[PDB]
Amino acid sequence: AEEEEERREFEAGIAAEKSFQDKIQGILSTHQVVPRNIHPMRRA
Amino acid sequence: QFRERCQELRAELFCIHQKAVCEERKAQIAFNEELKRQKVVEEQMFSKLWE
Amino acid sequence: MREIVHLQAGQCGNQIGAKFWEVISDEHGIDPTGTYHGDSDLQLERINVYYNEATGGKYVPRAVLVDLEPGTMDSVRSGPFGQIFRPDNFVFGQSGAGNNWAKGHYTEGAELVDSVLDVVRKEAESCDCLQGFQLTHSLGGGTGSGMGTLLISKIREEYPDRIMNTFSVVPSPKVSDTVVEPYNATLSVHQLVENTDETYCIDNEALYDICFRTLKLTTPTYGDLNHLVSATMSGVTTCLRFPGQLNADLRKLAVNMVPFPRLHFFMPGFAPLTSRGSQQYRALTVPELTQQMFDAKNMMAACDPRHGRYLTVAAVFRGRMSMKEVDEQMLNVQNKNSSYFVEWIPNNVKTAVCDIPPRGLKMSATFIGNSTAIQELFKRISEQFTAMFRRKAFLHWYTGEGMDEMEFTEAESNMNDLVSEYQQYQDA
Amino acid sequence: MRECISVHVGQAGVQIGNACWELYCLEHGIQPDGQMPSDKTIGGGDDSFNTFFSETGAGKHVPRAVFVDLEPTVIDEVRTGTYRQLFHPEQLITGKEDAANNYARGHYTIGKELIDLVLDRIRKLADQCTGLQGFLIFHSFGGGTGSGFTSLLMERLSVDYGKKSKLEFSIYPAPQVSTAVVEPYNSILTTHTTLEHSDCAFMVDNEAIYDICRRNLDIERPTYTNLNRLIGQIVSSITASLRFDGALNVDLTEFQTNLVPYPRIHFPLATYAPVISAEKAYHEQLSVAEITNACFEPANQMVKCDPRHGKYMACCLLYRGDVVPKDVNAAIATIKTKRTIQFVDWCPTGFKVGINYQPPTVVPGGDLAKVQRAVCMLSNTTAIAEAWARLDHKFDLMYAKRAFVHWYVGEGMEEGEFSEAREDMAALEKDYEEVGMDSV
Amino acid sequence: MRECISVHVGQAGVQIGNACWELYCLEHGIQPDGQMPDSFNTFFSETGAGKHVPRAVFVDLEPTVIDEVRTGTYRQLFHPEQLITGKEDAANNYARGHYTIGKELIDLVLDRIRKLADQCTGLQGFLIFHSFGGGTGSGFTSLLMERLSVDYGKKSKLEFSIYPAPQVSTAVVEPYNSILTTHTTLEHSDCAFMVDNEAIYDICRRNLDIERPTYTNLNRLIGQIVSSITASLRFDGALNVDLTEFQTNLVPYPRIHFPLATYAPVISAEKAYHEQLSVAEITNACFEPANQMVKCDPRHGKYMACCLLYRGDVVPKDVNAAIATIKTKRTIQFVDWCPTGFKVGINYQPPTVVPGGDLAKVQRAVCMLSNTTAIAEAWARLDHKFDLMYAKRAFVHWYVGEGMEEGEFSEAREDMAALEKDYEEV
Amino acid sequence: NSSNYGEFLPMPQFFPCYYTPREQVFSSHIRATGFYQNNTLNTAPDRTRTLDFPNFQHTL
Numbered sequence A: 001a002e003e004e005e006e007r008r009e010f011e012a013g014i015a016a017e018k019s020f021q022d023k024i025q026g027i028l029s030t031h032q033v034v035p036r037n038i039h040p041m042r043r044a
Numbered sequence B: 001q002f003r004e005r006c007q008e009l010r011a012e013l014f015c016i017h018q019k020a021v022c023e024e025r026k027a028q029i030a031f032n033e034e035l036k037r038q039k040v041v042e043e044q045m046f047s048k049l050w051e
Numbered sequence C: 001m002r003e004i005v006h007l008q009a010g011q012c013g014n015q016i017g018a019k020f021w022e023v024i025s026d027e028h029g030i031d032p033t034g035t036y037h038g039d040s041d042l043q044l045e046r047i048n049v050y051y052n053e054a055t056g057g058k059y060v061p062r063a064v065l066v067d068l069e070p071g072t073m074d075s076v077r078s079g080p081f082g083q084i085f086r087p088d089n090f091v092f093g094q095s096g097a098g099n100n101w102a103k104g105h106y107t108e109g110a111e112l113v114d115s116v117l118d119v120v121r122k123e124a125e126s127c128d129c130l131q132g133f134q135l136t137h138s139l140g141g142g143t144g145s146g147m148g149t150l151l152i153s154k155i156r157e158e159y160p161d162r163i164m165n166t167f168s169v170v171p172s173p174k175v176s177d178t179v180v181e182p183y184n185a186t187l188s189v190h191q192l193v194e195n196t197d198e199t200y201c202i203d204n205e206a207l208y209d210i211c212f213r214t215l216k217l218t219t220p221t222y223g224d225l226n227h228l229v230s231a232t233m234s235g236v237t238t239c240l241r242f243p244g245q246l247n248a249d250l251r252k253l254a255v256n257m258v259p260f261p262r263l264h265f266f267m268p269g270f271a272p273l274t275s276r277g278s279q280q281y282r283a284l285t286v287p288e289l290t291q292q293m294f295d296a297k298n299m300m301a302a303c304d305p306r307h308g309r310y311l312t313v314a315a316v317f318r319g320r321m322s323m324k325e326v327d328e329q330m331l332n333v334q335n336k337n338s339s340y341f342v343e344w345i346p347n348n349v350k351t352a353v354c355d356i357p358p359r360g361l362k363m364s365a366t367f368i369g370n371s372t373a374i375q376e377l378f379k380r381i382s383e384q385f386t387a388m389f390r391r392k393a394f395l396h397w398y399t400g401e402g403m404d405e406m407e408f409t410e411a412e413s414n415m416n417d418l419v420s421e422y423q424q425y426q427d428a
Numbered sequence D: 001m002r003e004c005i006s007v008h009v010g011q012a013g014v015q016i017g018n019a020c021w022e023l024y025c026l027e028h029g030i031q032p033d034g035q036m037p038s039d040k041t042i043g044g045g046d047d048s049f050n051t052f053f054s055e056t057g058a059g060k061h062v063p064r065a066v067f068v069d070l071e072p073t074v075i076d077e078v079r080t081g082t083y084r085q086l087f088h089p090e091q092l093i094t095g096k097e098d099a100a101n102n103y104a105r106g107h108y109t110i111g112k113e114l115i116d117l118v119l120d121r122i123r124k125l126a127d128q129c130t131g132l133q134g135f136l137i138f139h140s141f142g143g144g145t146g147s148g149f150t151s152l153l154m155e156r157l158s159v160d161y162g163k164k165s166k167l168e169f170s171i172y173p174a175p176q177v178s179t180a181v182v183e184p185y186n187s188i189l190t191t192h193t194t195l196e197h198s199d200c201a202f203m204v205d206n207e208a209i210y211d212i213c214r215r216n217l218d219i220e221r222p223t224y225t226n227l228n229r230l231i232g233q234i235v236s237s238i239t240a241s242l243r244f245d246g247a248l249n250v251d252l253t254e255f256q257t258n259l260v261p262y263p264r265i266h267f268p269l270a271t272y273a274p275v276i277s278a279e280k281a282y283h284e285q286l287s288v289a290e291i292t293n294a295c296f297e298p299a300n301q302m303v304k305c306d307p308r309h310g311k312y313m314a315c316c317l318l319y320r321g322d323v324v325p326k327d328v329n330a331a332i333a334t335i336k337t338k339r340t341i342q343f344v345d346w347c348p349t350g351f352k353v354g355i356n357y358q359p360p361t362v363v364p365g366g367d368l369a370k371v372q373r374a375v376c377m378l379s380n381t382t383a384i385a386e387a388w389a390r391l392d393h394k395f396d397l398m399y400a401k402r403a404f405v406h407w408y409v410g411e412g413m414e415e416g417e418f419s420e421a422r423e424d425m426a427a428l429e430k431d432y433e434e435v436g437m438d439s440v
Numbered sequence E: 001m002r003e004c005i006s007v008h009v010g011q012a013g014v015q016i017g018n019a020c021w022e023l024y025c026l027e028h029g030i031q032p033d034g035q036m037p038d039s040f041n042t043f044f045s046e047t048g049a050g051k052h053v054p055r056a057v058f059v060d061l062e063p064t065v066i067d068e069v070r071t072g073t074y075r076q077l078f079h080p081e082q083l084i085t086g087k088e089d090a091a092n093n094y095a096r097g098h099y100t101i102g103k104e105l106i107d108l109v110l111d112r113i114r115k116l117a118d119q120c121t122g123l124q125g126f127l128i129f130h131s132f133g134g135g136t137g138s139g140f141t142s143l144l145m146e147r148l149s150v151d152y153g154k155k156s157k158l159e160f161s162i163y164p165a166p167q168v169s170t171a172v173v174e175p176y177n178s179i180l181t182t183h184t185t186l187e188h189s190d191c192a193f194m195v196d197n198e199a200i201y202d203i204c205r206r207n208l209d210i211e212r213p214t215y216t217n218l219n220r221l222i223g224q225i226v227s228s229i230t231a232s233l234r235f236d237g238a239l240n241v242d243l244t245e246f247q248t249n250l251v252p253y254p255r256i257h258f259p260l261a262t263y264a265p266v267i268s269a270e271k272a273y274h275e276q277l278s279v280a281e282i283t284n285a286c287f288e289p290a291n292q293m294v295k296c297d298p299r300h301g302k303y304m305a306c307c308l309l310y311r312g313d314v315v316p317k318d319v320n321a322a323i324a325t326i327k328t329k330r331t332i333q334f335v336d337w338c339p340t341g342f343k344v345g346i347n348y349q350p351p352t353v354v355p356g357g358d359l360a361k362v363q364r365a366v367c368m369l370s371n372t373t374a375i376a377e378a379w380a381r382l383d384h385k386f387d388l389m390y391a392k393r394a395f396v397h398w399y400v401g402e403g404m405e406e407g408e409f410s411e412a413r414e415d416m417a418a419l420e421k422d423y424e425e426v
Numbered sequence F: 001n002s003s004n005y006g007e008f009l010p011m012p013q014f015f016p017c018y019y020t021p022r023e024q025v026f027s028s029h030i031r032a033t034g035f036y037q038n039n040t041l042n043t044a045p046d047r048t049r050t051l052d053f054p055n056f057q058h059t060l
């Protein structure tokens, strides 16, 4: 039982790693900008 | 929080800024060429009046 | 139950507190809006240590945040967290300290002190019994150094038995920011060796070198460096927050450290700091790789053991660990290296084990070390205080501010008394 | 809530200010009506104009400027220029008759009649301020209202205000080129009243700006549009730590702690590192370390003094744009290892850095291009001692043959202030000689 | 991070510059806007977003040949600030090149080179060429040698000189500057070798059928020489050797360094129909002296030191069978103390092909190097024909009138005779 | 030449891409009235270092 708990924890670690990398790829790929941060005449 | 902690976001933001500033420098280059043409035609009008 | 009241001081003080109140708010499972969110009941049972219950089941922290310029203080209100702070506990001046210790000790900042100590009693009278306060600051500028000494010596009188910690940021020569840097941190050690129970030495040069050579990052900005390094050593007090097999809280660990009451200067460090890539290849046992740290590539201060002798060493661990492999690995490390330890103490190491690791880690460990090699930092900041004071380089922003020329010659001999006490036990 | 009043004097003060208030309006959204444009802005939430503007009940803003002249013609163009609707109509204080290149007339006879009006109007912008930091004198050294009338502000602004940090930006007369022949009389007699009465005093000759324009850029034949556009960038980069957030906020107070060794030594230099043409800007990288070693050059220092002569006393750095706080601490590694750049013996650390986020804009029709990184480097050199030794040899050739003095005597000025002012700058000139001597 | 700087001085040097930079512009495909359609990082340096800059200098003291460079196709491929021009022409005059005119732009050139020194981290060699024939070549390069040496000392500065022929020349009082340059190249450069190349006249029509060439058809092959020397550094190989590792093996006596050999298959498409090329066979063709690029002969000389550059389909089997079979025959006389006489460098990527040149497409190629005493007879012939004009004192007044003496003229020759007395015993 | 200093019209092309201003909407709200100061009667509950309300039963 203890050995299988070690295997389960390692598999949960690699799964959370895959999810984290999918998140960083999504954040890099799709981008949004807050309006208050744009120079005033540059907004439209 | 995740956006601030992240690191490849702060990597790619530089490329965003640098491509933007290259395009806007190209716009300023076209404006400078326009101003040079304006001073050329002003000189030609003074040449006409000297004649 | 055993309360801690957090103090911050300076722009460096408020970018440590905004990153320290993030790590601990992940341990106890608190939302940014301030409610409770976690899964185990073991988290919430010791929440009355750093926090305070508000109405509706909210939880707010007890932190008194200072600066003399309001520009820093707004930026904490709009961060990742920071809506959980009570808005009454923010105090700030109107005009800055001028990056001047004398301005921030006598004339510009002493108007603020009677508002800052006045919040501190309100977070003291609600307590059961305080272990003691905790101040995070920097020895660079006037809002963190001059206020930091004036805060400490105004507290240590009125609340003497309760202990005091501080987290200094000493300057470094090869990474230096201000011309006044050796002219402040020589004059404020004098007011810090008198009224502090336990001090640390966390300098920015060492935190750069472990960030390009251990963690192997590319752009270490001040948010990505303060969080992963120096806002997580302050989570050494999980003994005082979580139950363990052999535990040792913040007060039990001070008595095993200071063998004379004027030598309290430490050099911390965190044990798993591998990389983004080398986390895949290493072994999370209890090894001796970062656990024989003598090759000092992973030390959080500048100076290291090769040049001097360790007086006393700590090690506070965190994880479901075995207490044999704690102890035989205090036997590969005291004999395979042999002469860097004090001769007249045969068991220098105080250990402790607790039972909740940080998030995402099976295993973690914290190293706190005292050494006689720390006197080479205190000579070296007094070499650049003797040189500049010889020709009276930047003097006249200090003589006109109520401080005379006698208070420099006190803080040069007393700065060189600490060099004298530490050099006694160099080899003996 | 960090106000900062800028007060300009003279023909150099006005025409720098026209380039200066072109740039300030263009950073924020102030169009020359003063109303920020309506784009159905729900939030707004910008309070970055508050250092240099005041918000009215309407959409307008008013600048803090006090434009002062004794010559009515150059202040008449800002009265009927495109900025006619921006400045409050009383802030453009004019004179009644010109000063005409006399320090005596500029300080005693014709400059004293106007000044009772202006010093009321500085109160009308002082009370509106809440946490006012310090002023900005923009003045010259050649003419009467630049040399003598500014000598009379400093003797009364000091006793009326005191602990406000005054800064100035003079235009020193060149060692070789000149416009006027009477100006070395003005330039010695203005030191004795601004040695004691200006807190920190930046100072830029118009030769290296006249040189760096023809050499770094691919342009020849500039006028005062192209000089004052360059100086107007420096005044924005110093103050920009008050306007926009960054990693390390160096306000106006903390410069003078980290830059002045002794109270009689407060004359630093100034530079601007990534000045480049827009045809030229995209050819080369402008990195963090390419804009510092190309800033410690002797060819791009804005005053005609060579810093390989004296030894450096104190240095301050003001980065701007996308600058990490790492690579400013590795650029210093390249500087201090060299043998060319000597620091003084009693100053081991010798630096003061500062980072700010918002990158510079460009004015439309402006010579210098847009960048990502930019830095202004304020240094305090010993080698400024030779910018006066080149001057007082042009003052003894005046005074020992006793020429051009008959104008100055009958105004209300006696001869005793000549030989007093010559020895007074000779007291200052000896003081730079002793701090560069190594102490063993 | 393995930088090398390249120099195109001289009218013959910019007629290399066409060729050497055409082959650098086809080793990696370089568009003339600096964006490609990390092996390039010797030469180039990426800008902010997307442009590359070559840190190579055309250093000529007349604006005419520089404005011909700018009116060439590669307008924005070469960035014009690096390239040195001078407002007043030096015109053979070492005095005007060195003292009077050059002193006002010497701080500008040093500002430029300390501006790109921040990019120059891991520099492997400042490769320099120059002709001796004028103030384009001699004086200002010489003053850069002394001032860069007293600015760093340690960095790699190398030079592969160009020399006048005995028969033909452009200027004929040019041996003054040749004697002066033989005196002044010994001081502050790590290396000074063979782009003296009179024999490329012989080679360009001997072997590749293009009679009526220019200097450019010659200087294709000078560029191909450059490719074989520095390509081992630029690309990964089996037994690659870089330029600092070159300098730590090339130089027996620290003032005695001057070899002679060629790039071996200088062969056109007409011979390339039929000649089955092998590493052994092309080096068999190469070891014949008559196809050199230094006008000298080591068949009757002593084959002292060597080096070898190999590119393409090279096998250690092939190179070692060739080494053995030509080591056997005493039709090549070998040398006394040094037994073997070969050193090897290996390149994967075969050299690129530029149109409008002499050569043709190759699967593989070989070279050699053979540092002998065969420059002793050439300097003896220059000794034979310099003294005719210094007997009766030609042209000295034009030199003298701006800031020099007859002392430098009376010192440089005796220093060259000191180098010949270094050379005569080995 | 004094009419150069306002002539041309600003484009959206000639502005910085970022704008990070300093907001004072939070700081002015606590500048407006003074910070907290005790003006109260002291009320601390009677604390004890170890014993909180003990039963002594079985004593005589």
Ligand SMILES: Nc1nc2c(ncn2[C@@H]2O[C@H](COP(=O)(O)OP(=O)(O)OP(=O)(O)O)[C@@H](O)[C@H]2O)c(=O)[nH]1
Binding pocket: D010, D011, D012, D013, D015, D016, D070, D071, D098, D099, D100, D101, D102, D106, D140, D141, D142, D143, D144, D145, D146, D147, D171, D179, D206, D224, D225, D227, D228
């Ligand atoms: N840098 C810079 N200097 C200027 C500019 N315009 C004028 N100057 C300098 O100003 C000096 C003369 O200007 P002023 O001193 O203000 O003339 P003035 O004071 O009105 O003369 P008075 O009639 O006596 O009052 C000259 O030496 C110029 O070098 C400018 O646009 N930029």
Ligand SMILES: Nc1nc2c(ncn2[C@@H]2O[C@H](COP(=O)(O)OP(=O)(O)OP(=O)(O)O)[C@@H](O)[C@H]2O)c(=O)[nH]1
Binding pocket: E009, E010, E011, E012, E013, E091, E092, E131, E132, E133, E134, E135, E136, E137, E162, E163, E164, E165, E168, E169, E170, E171, E174, E196, E197, E198, E199, E200, E201, E218
């Ligand atoms: N004989 C010969 N000389 C060559 C050859 N290639 C280059 N040269 C050199 O070319 C020099 C003269 O020709 P140029 O290079 O065109 O002229 P220059 O050296 O720049 O001299 P200036 O006209 O004064 O600028 C000679 O001194 C040689 O060193 C070659 O293939 N054969």
Ligand SMILES: Nc1nc2c(ncn2[C@@H]2O[C@H](COP(=O)(O)OP(=O)(O)O)[C@@H](O)[C@H]2O)c(=O)[nH]1
Binding pocket: C010, C011, C012, C013, C015, C016, C096, C097, C099, C100, C138, C139, C140, C141, C142, C143, C144, C145, C169, C177, C204, C222, C223, C226
């Ligand atoms: N750990 C940490 N140190 C900093 C940070 N920012 C600056 N520092 C360093 O800590 C010191 C902070 O100066 P500080 O006292 O806050 O400036 P002041 O408040 O105006 O007096 C300086 O010496 C900086 O080199 C940060 O975000 N984190």
Ligand SMILES: [Mg+2]
Binding pocket: D011, D071, D098, D099, D100, D101, D143, D144, D145
């Ligand atoms: Mg005037």
Ligand SMILES: [Mg+2]
Binding pocket: E009, E010, E011, E131, E133, E134, E135, E136, E137
């Ligand atoms: Mg030439």
